[PDB]
Amino acid sequence: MLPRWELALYLLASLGFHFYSFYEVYKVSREHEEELDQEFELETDTLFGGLKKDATDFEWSFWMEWGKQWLVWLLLGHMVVSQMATLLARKHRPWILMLYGMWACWCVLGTPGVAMVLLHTTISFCVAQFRSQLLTWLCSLLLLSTLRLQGVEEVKRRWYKTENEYYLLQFTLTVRCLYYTSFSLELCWQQLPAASTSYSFPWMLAYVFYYPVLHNGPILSFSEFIKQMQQQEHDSLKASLCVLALGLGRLLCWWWLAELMAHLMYMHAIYSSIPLLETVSCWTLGGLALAQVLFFYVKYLVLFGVPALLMRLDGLTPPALPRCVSTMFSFTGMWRYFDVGLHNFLIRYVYIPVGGSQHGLLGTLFSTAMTFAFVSYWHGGYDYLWCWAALNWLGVTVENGVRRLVETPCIQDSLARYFSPQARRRFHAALASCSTSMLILSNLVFLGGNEVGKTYWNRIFIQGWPWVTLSVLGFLYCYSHVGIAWAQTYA
Amino acid sequence: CGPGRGFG
Amino acid sequence: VLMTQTPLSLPVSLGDQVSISCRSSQSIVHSNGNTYLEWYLQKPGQSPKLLIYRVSNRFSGVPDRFSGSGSGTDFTLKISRVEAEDLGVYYCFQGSHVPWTFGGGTKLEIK
Amino acid sequence: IQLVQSGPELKKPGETVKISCKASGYTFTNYGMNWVRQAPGKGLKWMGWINTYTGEPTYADDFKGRFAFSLETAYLQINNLKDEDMATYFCARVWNYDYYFDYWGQGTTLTVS
Ligand SMILES: CCCCCCCCCCCCCCCC(=O)SCCNC(=O)CCNC(=O)[C@H](O)C(C)(C)COP(=O)(O)OP(=O)(O)OC[C@H]1O[C@@H](n2cnc3c(N)ncnc32)[C@H](O)[C@@H]1OP(=O)(O)O
Ligand code: HEM
Ligand SMILES: *C(=O)CCCCCCCCCCCCCCC
Numbered sequence: 001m002l003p004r005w006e007l008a009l010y011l012l013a014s015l016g017f018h019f020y021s022f023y024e025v026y027k028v029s030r031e032h033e034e035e036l037d038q039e040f041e042l043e044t045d046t047l048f049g050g051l052k053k054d055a056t057d058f059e060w061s062f063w064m065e066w067g068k069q070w071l072v073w074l075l076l077g078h079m080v081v082s083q084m085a086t087l088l089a090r091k092h093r094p095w096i097l098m099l100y101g102m103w104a105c106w107c108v109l110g111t112p113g114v115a116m117v118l119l120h121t122t123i124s125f126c127v128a129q130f131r132s133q134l135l136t137w138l139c140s141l142l143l144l145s146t147l148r149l150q151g152v153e154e155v156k157r158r159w160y161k162t163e164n165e166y167y168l169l170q171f172t173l174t175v176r177c178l179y180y181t182s183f184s185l186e187l188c189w190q191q192l193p194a195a196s197t198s199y200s201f202p203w204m205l206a207y208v209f210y211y212p213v214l215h216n217g218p219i220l221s222f223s224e225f226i227k228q229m230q231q232q233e234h235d236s237l238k239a240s241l242c243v244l245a246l247g248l249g250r251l252l253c254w255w256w257l258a259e260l261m262a263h264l265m266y267m268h269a270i271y272s273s274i275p276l277l278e279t280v281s282c283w284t285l286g287g288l289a290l291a292q293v294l295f296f297y298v299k300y301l302v303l304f305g306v307p308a309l310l311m312r313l314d315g316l317t318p319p320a321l322p323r324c325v326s327t328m329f330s331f332t333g334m335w336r337y338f339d340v341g342l343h344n345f346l347i348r349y350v351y352i353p354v355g356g357s358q359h360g361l362l363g364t365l366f367s368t369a370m371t372f373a374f375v376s377y378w379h380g381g382y383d384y385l386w387c388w389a390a391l392n393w394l395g396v397t398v399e400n401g402v403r404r405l406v407e408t409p410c411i412q413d414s415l416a417r418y419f420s421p422q423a424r425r426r427f428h429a430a431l432a433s434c435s436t437s438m439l440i441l442s443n444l445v446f447l448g449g450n451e452v453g454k455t456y457w458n459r460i461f462i463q464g465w466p467w468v469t470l471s472v473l474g475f476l477y478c479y480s481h482v483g484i485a486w487a488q489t490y491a
Numbered sequence: 492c493g494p495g496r497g498f499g
Numbered sequence: 500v501l502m503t504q505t506p507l508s509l510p511v512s513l514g515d516q517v518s519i520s521c522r523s524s525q526s527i528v529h530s531n532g533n534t535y536l537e538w539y540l541q542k543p544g545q546s547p548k549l550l551i552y553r554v555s556n557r558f559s560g561v562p563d564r565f566s567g568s569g570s571g572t573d574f575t576l577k578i579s580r581v582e583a584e585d586l587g588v589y590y591c592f593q594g595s596h597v598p599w600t601f602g603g604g605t606k607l608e609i610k
Numbered sequence: 611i612q613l614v615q616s617g618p619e620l621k622k623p624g625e626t627v628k629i630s631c632k633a634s635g636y637t638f639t640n641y642g643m644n645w646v647r648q649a650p651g652k653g654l655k656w657m658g659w660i661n662t663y664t665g666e667p668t669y670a671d672d673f674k675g676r677f678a679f680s681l682e683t684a685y686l687q688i689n690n691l692k693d694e695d696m697a698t699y700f701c702a703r704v705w706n707y708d709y710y711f712d713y714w715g716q717g718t719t720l721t722v723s
Binding site for chain 2: 057167171341380
Binding site for chain 1: 640641642661662663664704705706707708709710
């Protein structure tokens with residue numbers, strides 16, 4: 001174990017560079033407030049003493065715009081209906097929840113939204129009746145591809161007036177793709193007599209039309225859903241009130257933090273203006289990167305707590321909420337611990353069926369590639385997303401290869417003999433810093449886009465290699481000590 | 492997660 | 500789940516009705532709304548064969564005289580007329596609660 | 611539809627043995643496979659099962675840490691470390707609905723002494 005004093009020094013350095021970079025980004029935003037306001041409209045509110053919120057982000061300004069109008073009221077109605085069903089008719093709770101989900105989808109997306117969800121569900125079920133996993137995967141891929149077609153997009157836009165309902169329908173269908181694909185694959189793999197009647201059409205309708213995750217919520221494993229819908233054990237509503245109170249308090253705190261950190265610094269406006277990235281100093285570049293990844297983390301905390309809170313009230317166990325990205329230090333850790341539900345779906349339904357490590361390293365590579373391909377194609381399959389997927393697969397493959405190489409008994413014995421485990425920890429932290437220096441760039445490409453990632457690569461690494469790259473590596477080195485030191489808690 | 496990607 | 504059988508050894512003469520009772524430790528009714536309790540006849544020196552799959556149901560091989568009716572916890576199997584070719588060991592098996600457990604075995608003998 | 615097993619096997623207490631269950635007459639991956647054992651002085655004990663479609667075995671709590679189910683798709687093998695157990699091992703096809711075991715193997719008597 002490392003001595004406590006120098007680990008505390010590493011934590012101090014990590015917090016110091018986070019906070020100084022945040023201050024630099026705040027200064028840059030304040031000194032460039034007028035031109036950014038002129039180019040992109042900035043929302044004016046009295047929540048923070050007159051500071052102007054940066055509404056350039058799409059997911060935040062879309063989900064809060066929907067929540068203030070329809071989503072929060074419908075989610076509260078779902079909570080009330082679930083509690084009433086648990087109190088009065090516990091046996092028929094899944095069907096009541098399914099009916100409420102259909103009614104909520106109708107009232108929020110018109111008849112076409114419900115009709116399209118039903119069509120996708122029915123087609124997936126009819127195809128899965130053949131009990132072939134490959135045919136089911138092609139059916140799911142075709143159903144997902146029907147979203148990206150220009151003609152279908154034009155028809156769907158003609159369906160709706162506000163043009164935000166079309167985006168809501170697209171997101172709902174994209175999530176439904178995963179949900180009915182998971183159910184269909186589970187039906188294909190079902191060979192147990194006890195579970196023969198669990199995979200029926202009404203159960204598929206109940207699984208698909210679950211309101212908390214109808215639109216954006218995390219992928220809920222069908223095994224857990226079917227297990228919890230049939231417990232017939234009450235949740236002691238007196239404790240459910242306390243659970244709701246604590247969840248609401250935490251969600252309000254998270255939302256306030258997200259609003260504060262969007263108000264103080266205009267991350268999205270700065271990334272939208274590529275010419276401003278070249279002008280601002282390297283400290284501002286690092287601060288923008290850290291603030292952007294942290295804001296994505298906080299935004300998805302807010303956007304996943306509400307489905308998680310609704311599940312916890314419903315008795316379900318939700319997938320674990322994202323861990324703080326300032327803890328993350330490697331590609332595998334980021335994938336395992338950030339988006340738990342989608343990672344579990346990819347492992348169970350995309351990674352394993354193609355074939356995991358059982359086919360050897362080369363086969364593993366293919367499997368990983370396939371998984372990554374799908375997730376990129378799931379998010380839209382844009383060019384920047386494909387570049388992010390390629391870079392991310394390269395990172396994961398390099399991590400796995402190095403871990404396999406170092407864990408060989410001969411090399412492990414040699415490194416144990418040469419130096420103490422303290423030196424091994426220091427070298428592992430330096431390596432993980434060199435890895436996270438590219439992990440953050442890949443995530444910036446995912447968030448900022450191709451231009452933002454290229455600008456970061458040029459300025460941080462190519463243009464300023466002699467001292468800027470070394471300083472970034474050292475700061476991420478202390479950061480990696482902190483991350484690895486905390487990683488033992490959840491290892 | 493989140494199907495909202497590529498909009499800015 | 501521990502499942503017991505009464506009697507352990509059941510001697511009946513040829514052509515006489517026989518009743519075998521299987522008592523479970525707890526409820527066998529599965530969450531699906533049905534109970535998976537089935538009865539297996541293992542003749543000496545070979546593998547068991549299924550007789551009734553769900554309560555009061557009958558397999559294709561089993562003749563009409565292997566009717567067995569049971570409650571939620573205590574189940575029973577009845578042979579109306581023993582044809583002297585039904586001798587063997589009868590096991591009651593539950594599939595609802597993992598791990599799946601067989602019965603002790605009710606050996607039949609000619610008195 | 612039939613299932614045929616390897617045959618009698620004699621092994622030393624320290625060694626290990628593999629038992630094969632070959633299924634013919636039906637689509638092998640359609641139905642899972644159940645491995646049970648019958649001790650000379652006891653009744654049937656359900657050791658575990660293997661999902662032929664995906665190859666994901668689930669074992670009973672008692673029969674864990676030493677037994678492993680593998681595929682050869684249409685034989686299906688079991689591996690274990692030898693010990694005082696000498697039970698006869700049965701292989702059973704599991705039907706999709708309403709009943710568990712329909713067709714059984716002959717059973718490979720195992721002698722370990
Ligand atoms: C559309 C058209 C335009 C597109 C325009 C797109 C633009 C978009 C950007 C453009 C860019 C251009 C193209 C460039 C693109 C790249 O720049 S290439 C990107 C490739 N990605 C990477 O290289 C990242 C991977 N880097 C790394 O360093 C690896 O992750 C690591 C850290 C070495 C893997 O190590 P690990 O997974 O942490 O393994 P692990 O066993 O967990 O720990 C390390 C072990 O080393 C042991 N160890 C002990 N002593 C030692 C010792 N002397 N040495 C080594 N190991 C030791 C430790 O004991 C430790 O073991 P444990 O203590 O854990 O038991
Ligand atoms: C060196 C810097 C940091 C370290 C070591 C760190 C560490 C942690 C850890 C280990 C957690 C627990 C994660 C979980 O249980 O889900 C956490 C929670 C959290 N972190 Fe950080 N963090 C850092 C910086 C930040 C920053 C700068 C922000 C926001 C601007 C932030 C936002 C959050 C939030 C919102 C939580 C949730 C707390 C909760 O759920 O109770 N973190 N932090
Ligand atoms: C749903 O689509 C999200 C899953 C995909 C992962 C997205 C990565 C988010 C960025 C995390 C940043 C971690 C880097 C840590 C550097 C400080």
